[PDB]
Write a structure and sequence with these properties.
Chain lengths: 221, 224, 224
């Protein structure tokens, strides 16, 4: 009879610019005619839930409920609760959810290794973000102000640092070719975190990053 | 009554050079006299186990059976299954664990990325990551050794292996190492070793230094 | 009657990833239908001993045999005996051979030695020597690789370990690499590896290129 809900993380809010609600009910016998209605703490109705789900094949029933609530009370601490009406229990079970240090992340960009440029077949550029709380952040890539497709980069799950008790680190690699890296392709990444007052921190790099921008010495035969 | 299965990963059989297969059982009554016996495909004698775990505060009992086999036994293809016979199980549960064959092997690509100059400006911390990519299958072991002698295991965290966006059968891993700013431009090797079951020697190592990025041909200095 | 045995050397265990000991019996005559097999301390059965060798034409008898022995079992200290049952000697001859424990080990130190300038001017052949010293015991496996690919066994030969006169309990071994000078101008990997028991990962990769021991030359000291 355990009911688990997935609160909308900051990564899913900044991406589509439209936060929603969704609660799931498991460990229940499969049945029919189950209505899921969301109820706020005050006691007013919400948007009409549509797009019902089905039952899991493993002799279990799953129910879903959608809503459309703007950012007016989520940041304050409003307790969202969905109501599930099942025939097995006489009294519907209600489960409430809420919003659980704010360290500013520091984005560091690392140039590709010299051993990889000799292959002249691929290039890896990372977007390192360390010291951020909480986890589940969103980092994307933009090229000359135009974001790239999500299929070209994968964001790893944040993990706690070994020495830092309350700071997390994230990684975001980008698989590109070596030929393009020599003709620009800055590949500026932006991290979306709620701890930053501006919530945006982006840095740009190019081929001439290690140069102190004072001298340019090469070798000519 | 549930029973789990944790096959011996490649990273767990390298730091100790001794394989150990254990099966986990959960949702059991808090009672003593627990007998967990292992067997082979045909049925042979195994080694006894001890150090029985305690019970959970929510009235849940758990146990683990320790076993020991050879190194080539796991790669031979022989399946193993632990037998748990308690005093309240109508039917003894069983789960088969083996090594799933039929996976392509690729040599991992190790590139020890040096820390950026912007991080060193603060002069308060330094992060050294070791990029590991192009390895298959998963469960790769990454270790840090400072001048031969290794460091504490609680000084580096290895990210979970995930498939590459552009490669359907390749994985990438990360492992950062936080050090002091004054400990970067000193030396101490700082070699990243990666253990994977794809190389002929199964062990590779890549090391850099403060002069790795320099062309080591000319020393141009600016004096104000 | 003299019965010999070849213990599995460390250079062969790491190469084939399988310990295969061979029992050789000499000082005999020409017969047929021999019966020789190995046994453990407990007295169990072993693998087959097929693939016999032909008798030498000099009226000398020779016998070979392979067996599958786990690496952990050999390192534990189990003694193996080669049972010899022949018509010439009806008495069962016992030949116990194992690994003598109780010897201190030292971490080998690899020092790459680039070729001298007296050879590059000839433009005939390039020789790369990988001197390894400070290791014990003997039977160390040293090979060469070319970007994750081992070279041919007929190209590089590892010299037999010899005792160091200054070191009371250490040994040194050499491994030359005779290659063409045309392919040595650029250099791809030119890495040297050593397989020793005292090493943590048992493999130490040391690479060398054209510009390895050459320091900076154009030390510019401009000031404005
Ligand atoms: C130095 O200048 C040349 C031509 O002015 C240019 O091609 C080269 O890229 C410069 N060096 C660097 C490191 O950008
Ligand atoms: C010197 O300047 C010329 C043109 O201004 C440029 O092509 C050349 O690369 C420069 N020298 C170096 C070492 O970059
Ligand atoms: C290179 O130049 C820097 C300039 O300060 C100096 O400190 C360093 O010792 C020089 N290195 C060599 C090998 O000459
Ligand atoms: C290289 O030049 C720098 C410039 O100050 C000097 O300090 C250093 O001693 C020089 N090194 C050598 C080996 O000449």
């Amino acid at each position: 009879i355990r009911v688990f809900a997935i609160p909308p993380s900051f990564a899913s809010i900044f991406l589509t610019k439209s936060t929603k609600l969704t609660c799931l009910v498991t460990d229940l016998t499969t049945y029919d005619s189950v209505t899921i209605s969301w109820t706020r703490q005050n006691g007013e109705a919400v948007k009409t839930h549509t797009n019902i789900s089905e039952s899991h094949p493993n002799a279990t029933f799953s129910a879903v409920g959608e809503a459309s609530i703007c950012e007016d009370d989520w940041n304050s601490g409003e307790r969202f609760t969905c109501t599930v009406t099942h025939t097995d229990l006489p009294s519907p079970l209600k489960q409430t959810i809420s919003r659980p240090a704010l360290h500013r992340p520091d984005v560091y960009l690392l140039p590709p290794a010299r051993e990889q440029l000799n292959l002249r077949e691929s290039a890896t550029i990372t977007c390192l973000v360390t010291g951020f709380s909480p986890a589940d952040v969103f980092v994307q890539w933009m090229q000359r102000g135009q974001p790239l497709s999500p299929e070209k980069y994968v964001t790893s799950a944040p993990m706690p640092e070994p020495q830092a008790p309350g700071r997390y680190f994230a990684h975001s690699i980008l698989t590109v070719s070596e030929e393009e890296w020599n003709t620009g392709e800055t590949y500026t990444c932006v991290v979306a975190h709620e701890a930053l007052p501006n919530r945006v921190t982006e840095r740009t790099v190019d081929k001439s990053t290690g140069k102190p921008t004072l001298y340019n010495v090469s070798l000519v035969m």
